[PDB]
Write a protein that binds this ligand. Structure first.
Ligand SMILES: [Zn+2]
Ligand SMILES: [Zn+2]
Lengths: 453, 453
């Protein structure tokens, strides 16, 4: 060829993730549309993937995890979540169907049944999602020949992870995908230091909660143990994780009017290199003009990369002063619900932001991680936000330039037509869009069983 | 004259604050020197005051609160602390002496007896401190003729306030001086919006805790009430307070190795204009050269003024959109324990920082508060740190330039000689220093009863 395979970014498809679906068949079909975390999100993410590959056919490699599974008992789950939550999750799923045919809510009465659901199919879905995560990590670390190994991967998985706490699910998240990826990468490839860059509209309170666990502080779920000193702390183990988020402080999990002291505090935490914590949270600002947003980016949002840069410089020093091998990774919590295209707080981001942000993540990974970048899909709910966001994210993951018209309402509207389950075709923008739609709808054959029929 | 009295900054002396003294007479005289919060701090603060007045005899006015008292039942205490803590404080003081002559600790067994003390004399001391605070506020707001009213005051009070929570004392603080000043200024002069700028080495966890109370969130001390919604929130009332701190995140109340999740979170909180909160916490950085510290100041510490500027601009908008009168105040929590001269974590500040910081506070108050600035003494414990810090702080409070040699080890060492209770005199620096010492030792006559004898 000309472009070598190692120079391409890997896109990991997760066919088992399609199986997790809202199950309560006795609700209004209008309430049913209120449920935004659904299998159709993967069809929209495939449209974004298709768009990137159509613009740049030589820059991406599609990889399906197919039937590869990870165990809910695997060490990269147990060491992230303990053994009590995984076993309770499996129990709930195994009793769900029986409850659900009696018109009963399938989750515990202490949970917000409106923001979390499960069924017996959820187990296979999560096992497959773990498989797809392992595939992503393997794609960028595995092999005898470092030169023949890709550096960047995007993993199109659901349900999302960043709201799942150490021992408690919430916000449609049953498992913290990012910390599972991190633990697998540490166990399998000796990755020692990871930064998580989270540009979802929502605070990743679950990802951050588990950062506190990794610092050695006792989780709220766990019964107090003599393992912890009088301050509820013990030794912080590898891998070391730094969490860097930009999000709307007036949205979930701290929606204006519906917010607790404790969640407001976590969503506002800024601390580096102290008490075994590395956590930085920044809040989205309103803007109107293109130049207003650029000022916000250059003066406010870009500082996430500065803090993450400090994290890696400090880590290299501690490792070399101690005679230990350093190995970094940049993880992106790629959520697209802050997009201008997300369904209707006026703090949004323009579609181009996803290209810009990802390009700056590339610079960070080149300087400290030998270019290793792992992006995992998080939130993002309308067809338009997911499709346009994945598209610009992938364009930036391969260090290409965004063209403003690529994210125009006209173009995104034509692509999204292909998400309707019974889409039939019908001028330049239409011809290109139907080329994108044909590939996107074919990309996972299971779309047909789960959606088109 | 030439310089009008209104152009001078007011220095408020608090003779009753001398009476609060560590009382447990059965300890080692070495342990006794471990107790840093002591009446002698006011003698050192008088040396700094004396130094500023000797350099600039026309720029300051000394004012003693003399025997003016505020009540521990006054509204500007009850509305800051509730009625339960004030009454419990008075009870403890009234039972202390009887306990103390039996060799008993006078505070409750659930408190850290090592970081908090009281005696029967503490009540009069606190009443007088409140009186001195009222004097400071009155000095810059009271009178028929706005043109004939000073804009700036420094209040030399102890014990400090910034560690006192809503309902719980700690860190040698029995009363939150800053929020008492704020409430008095709101009750008496209709001050609606206050920024607190805190450059003490330690996080002002008490001042910040009370900011949460003012936002309408339930304090941990208070029993849950139907006054609060399901999120523990109710309506936020005037005055609106914003808290802006730079401090060492590895020092008390979050000392490295001895720190709780909850205190680490509060000491790292950054949030503006949301959930009725305005809180910004920044962490001191190590430096070695003069130019290293200047970079830290210009790129990290100065942002406190930017955030406080945003606070006032937002406040003016909300008030004018609602037809309400805005009136601002800048309060400085002036603690000097971050000084290079404080007794031995290597994050320090050069003496000149206190001039620079205060000058930037002047600019903020000129733009938004008609120049109104109220500085209240907080921490700072060695004779050298308090004397040099107050000196440079006062030099900056009157917008003068610091001269590096003014804070040289030679000069500060000569002044501090005058703090020894039996000081006798003995060349240019010595002559100037003894002029400073004579005035400083005479400034409060009660020094003689409490210290010199
Ligand atoms: Zn989300
Ligand atoms: Zn202090």
């Amino acid at each position: 060829a000309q472009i070598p395979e190692s120079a391409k970014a890997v896109v990991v498809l997760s066919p088992y993730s399609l199986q997790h679906v809202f199950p309560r068949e006795w609700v209004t079909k209008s309430y049913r549309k209120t449920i935004v975390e659904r299998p159709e999100r993967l069809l929209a993410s495939s449209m974004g993937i298709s768009a990137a590959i159509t613009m740049y056919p030589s820059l991406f490699t599609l990889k399906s995890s197919h039937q590869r599974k990870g165990s809910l008992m695997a060490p990269h789950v147990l060491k992230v979540h303990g053994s009590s939550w995984p076993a309770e999750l499996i129990e709930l799923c195994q009793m769900a169907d029986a409850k659900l045919l009696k018109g009963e809510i399938e989750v515990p009465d202490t949970w917000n049944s409106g923001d979390i659901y499960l069924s017996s199919k959820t187990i296979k879905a999560l096992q497959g999602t773990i498989g797809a995560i392992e595939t992503g990590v393997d794609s960028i670390f595995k092999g005898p020949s470092a030169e023949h190994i890709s550096n960047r991967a995007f993993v199109a998985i659901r349900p999302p992870g960043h709201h799942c706490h150490y021992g408690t699910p919430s916000g449609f998240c049953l498992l913290n995908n990012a910390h599972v990826a991190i633990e697998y990468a540490y166990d399998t490839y000796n990755v020692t230091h990871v930064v998580v860059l989270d540009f979802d509209l929502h605070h990743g309170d679950g990802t951050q909660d588990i950062c506190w666990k990794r610092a050695g502080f006792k989780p709220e779920e766990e019964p107090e143990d003599s393992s912890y000193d009088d301050f509820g702390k013990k030794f912080a183990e590898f891998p070391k994780v730094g969490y860097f988020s930009m999000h709307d402080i007036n949205s979930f999990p701290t929606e204006s009017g519906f917010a607790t002291k404790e969640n407001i505090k976590n969503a506002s935490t800024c601390i580096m290199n102290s008490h075994d914590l590395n956590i930085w949270n920044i809040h989205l600002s309103k803007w109107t003009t293109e130049e207003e947003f650029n000022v916000l980016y250059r003066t406010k949002y870009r500082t996430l990369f500065a803090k993450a840069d400090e994290f890696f410089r400090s880590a290299k020093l501690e490792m070399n002063q101690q005679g230990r091998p350093f190995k970094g990774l940049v993880v992106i919590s790629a959520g697209f619900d802050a997009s201008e295209f997300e369904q209707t707080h006026s703090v949004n981001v323009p579609t181009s932001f996803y290209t810009t942000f990802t390009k700056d993540a590339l610079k960070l990974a080149q300087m400290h991680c030998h270019g290793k970048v792992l992006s995992l899909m998080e939130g993002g709910y309308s067809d338009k936000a997911i499709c346009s966001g994945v598209f610009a994210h992938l364009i930036g993951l391969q260090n290409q330039d965004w063209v403003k018209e690529w994210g125009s309402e006209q173009v995104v509207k034509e692509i999204v037509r292909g998400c309707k389950p019974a889409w039939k075709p019908y001028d330049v923008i239409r011809i290109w869009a139907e080329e994108v739609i044909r590939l996107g709808r074919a990309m996972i054959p299971e779309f047909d069983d789960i959606i088109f029929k």
